[PDB]
Amino acid sequence: STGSATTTPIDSLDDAYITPVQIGTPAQTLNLDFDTGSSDLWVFSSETTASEVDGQTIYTPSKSTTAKLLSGATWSISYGDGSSSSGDVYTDTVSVGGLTVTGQAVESAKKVSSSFTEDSTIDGLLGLAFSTLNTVSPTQQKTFFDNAKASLDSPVFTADLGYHAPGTYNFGFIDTTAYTGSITYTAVSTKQGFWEWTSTGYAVGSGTFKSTSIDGIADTGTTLLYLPATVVSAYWAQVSGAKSSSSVGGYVFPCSATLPSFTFGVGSARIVIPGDYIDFGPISTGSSSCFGGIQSSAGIGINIFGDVALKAAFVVFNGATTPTLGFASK
């Protein structure tokens, strides 16, 4: 089997991407944030505290003839941005782009933090990291990809995120029309539960490539590109007036600037992030200070190849017995 679904930016900045997902019988369609940096499929639901729902579409398990309470199971998750959610668990039928999994753990939110409430466009998350990170207790649950893997034509999914435009998540096949050149594959460590790999270096604009190993995660659920402070300083030094602002929370730059590109290495190959992808617009409405799309990871503990980087590539998440990542230009 295969599946193919369009993913759409939630706003004009590509702050996140939503993909429609069918849950239950009859289908209830919710727009979920596919997140290769976590491993829980959770949804706003009829059980979510009413004051914490503000425009999201909810899953109502009592209206699904295939929903079953997973007795005793609870979940609770906290994300790198400080947001969180928690609740109980049902199993139900879940379909993405024509690919159907029966018995998928659907984690029903009883509580969500303010950032989720405040984002009316995201009805939940669909985790695509390794199932060892799944938070369901006392019986850890498998991700949608893990449950589908054996049925797929090939044990892979691909992320093809658009810049200010829709893109595609495919399951079970590699669309050879969706990229240019060849796909370069690189090793993955699953030791932290992430799609963790080592970039071979970087360049700023037309500058010379610096060969240096940068360990980080391919994370579709993180908006920006978070890299070591040395790398980020080298980037922003090429932008007149750019500075790191403690009050704003990162590097800002004059909105009048033209940003240079940023290149990252994948083995001997190179992925080029155009400068425009690094512009996240005014820090507040009407400001001439703009927020940068490349930020320091120094306070995180891990480097994160978020959407800013991944949207410049066609990315293969290869879930073979030894997982690997592939990147192609497009």
UniProtKB/Swiss-Prot annotation:
One of its GO terms (biological process) is proteolysis. It catalyses: Hydrolysis of proteins with specificity similar to that of pepsin A, prefers hydrophobic residues at P1 and P1', but does not cleave 14-Ala-|-Leu-15 in the B chain of insulin or Z-Glu-Tyr. Clots milk. It comes from the Eukaryota. Residues 17-328 form the Peptidase A1 domain. GO terms for molecular function: aspartic-type endopeptidase activity. Disulfide bonds join 255-290. Belongs to the peptidase A1 family. This is Endothiapepsin.
